[PDB]
Amino acid sequence: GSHMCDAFVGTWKLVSSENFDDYMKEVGVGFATRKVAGMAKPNMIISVNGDVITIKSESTFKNTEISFILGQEFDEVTADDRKVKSTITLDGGVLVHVQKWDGKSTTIKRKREDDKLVVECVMKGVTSTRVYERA
Numbered sequence: 001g002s003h004m005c006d007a008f009v010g011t012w013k014l015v016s017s018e019n020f021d022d023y024m025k026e027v028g029v030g031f032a033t034r035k036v037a038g039m040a041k042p043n044m045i046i047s048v049n050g051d052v053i054t055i056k057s058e059s060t061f062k063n064t065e066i067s068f069i070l071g072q073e074f075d076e077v078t079a080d081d082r083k084v085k086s087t088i089t090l091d092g093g094v095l096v097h098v099q100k101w102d103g104k105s106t107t108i109k110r111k112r113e114d115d116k117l118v119v120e121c122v123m124k125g126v127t128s129t130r131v132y133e134r135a
């Protein structure tokens with residue numbers, strides 16, 4: 001029945017963001033998309049069905065959905081319209097999401113901390129932290 005990844009399941013709303021604009025610059029997002037994407041207040045809906053995890057983000061800018069099995073690479077179109085190759089694993093209770101494209105890489109870690117879901121993103125040393133709470 002239950003799995004350790006069940007502490008991520010639910011509906012989550014963004015409550016704070018730090019340095020996201022700079023992270024998006026590093027990733028290569030252009031001005032207009034950065035401004036509109038940075039303005040978004042996404043909710044994230046995380047569900048599990050068997051081995052398949054689904055993460056949906058809903059906002060006024062774009063809605064995105066990925067479904068995956070841990071440790072099994074998939075192709076993803078990101079909200080900023082990159083086409084990337086992604087792998088997501090669980091490493092000591094942290095969901096680790098690596099995206100690779102055009103010889104570049106970025107890592108997005110998701111962890112439960114108290115009542116929050118904390119998202120830490122890094123690209124070439126540029127960092128962002130986004131904090132979600134249950135909706």
Ligand SMILES: O=C(O)c1cc(C2CCCCC2)c(OCC(F)(F)F)nc1C(F)(F)F
Pocket residue numbers: 024027029037038040042057058059061062063064078079080108119121130
């Ligand atoms: O989870 C997040 O809050 C998050 C959210 C977004 C989107 C979701 C839809 C509305 C606009 C922002 C995102 O987009 C990708 C890029 F940032 F590159 F534009 N990246 C991340 C993150 F990097 F942190 F995983």
